[PDB]
Amino acid sequence: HMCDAFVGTWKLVSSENFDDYMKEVGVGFATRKVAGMAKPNMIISVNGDVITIKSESTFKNTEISFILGQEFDEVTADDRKVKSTITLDGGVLVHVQKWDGKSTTIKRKREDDKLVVECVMKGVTSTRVYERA
Numbered sequence: 001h002m003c004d005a006f007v008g009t010w011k012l013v014s015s016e017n018f019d020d021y022m023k024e025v026g027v028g029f030a031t032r033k034v035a036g037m038a039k040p041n042m043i044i045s046v047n048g049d050v051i052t053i054k055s056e057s058t059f060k061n062t063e064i065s066f067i068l069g070q071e072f073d074e075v076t077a078d079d080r081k082v083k084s085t086i087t088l089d090g091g092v093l094v095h096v097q098k099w100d101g102k103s104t105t106i107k108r109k110r111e112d113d114k115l116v117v118e119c120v121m122k123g124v125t126s127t128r129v130y131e132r133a
């Protein structure tokens with residue numbers, strides 16, 4: 001029941017500062033423009049200990065399946081090849097991605113009827129809010 005309140009289909013409704021976050025991550029112009037337009041659905045499910053987070057959109061489709069605390073390989077929507085570890089900390093999914101000597105942290109939390117995704121790279125944060133589909 002660890003992630004019960006995250007499970008579902010969630011549609012992006014707002015994004016703040018995503019362009020500056022993407023710049024900090026190293027995403028190039030064209031990818032920033034196309035990624036910034038899209039309105040993905042994030043689909044979260046749990047089967048035993050395995051959590052799956054998918055995104056479906058007009059830009060990219062992504063899928064990660066993982067066990068909390070167990071590092072895995074991920075191909076991000078912007079085509080970084082990263083090493084990811086996701087844990088639960090105080091009810092928040094905390095996802096660290098490591099690549100090329102760099103790191104970014106993505107937090108996913110349930111707040112009211114939303115799923116809030118906060119992405120941080122160095123001093124730059126972006127907030128993306130998703131609602132039930």
Ligand SMILES: CC(C)Cc1c2c(nc(-c3ccccc3)c1-c1nnn[nH]1)CCCCC2
Pocket residue numbers: 022025027035036038039040041042055056057058059060061062076077078106117119128
């Ligand atoms: C929010 C982040 C944790 C995951 C993420 C990333 C990127 N693009 C997207 C994305 C996917 C589909 C449609 C539009 C944009 C998404 C994402 N947004 N919702 N799901 N996936 C590329 C830019 C760097 C950060 C990684």
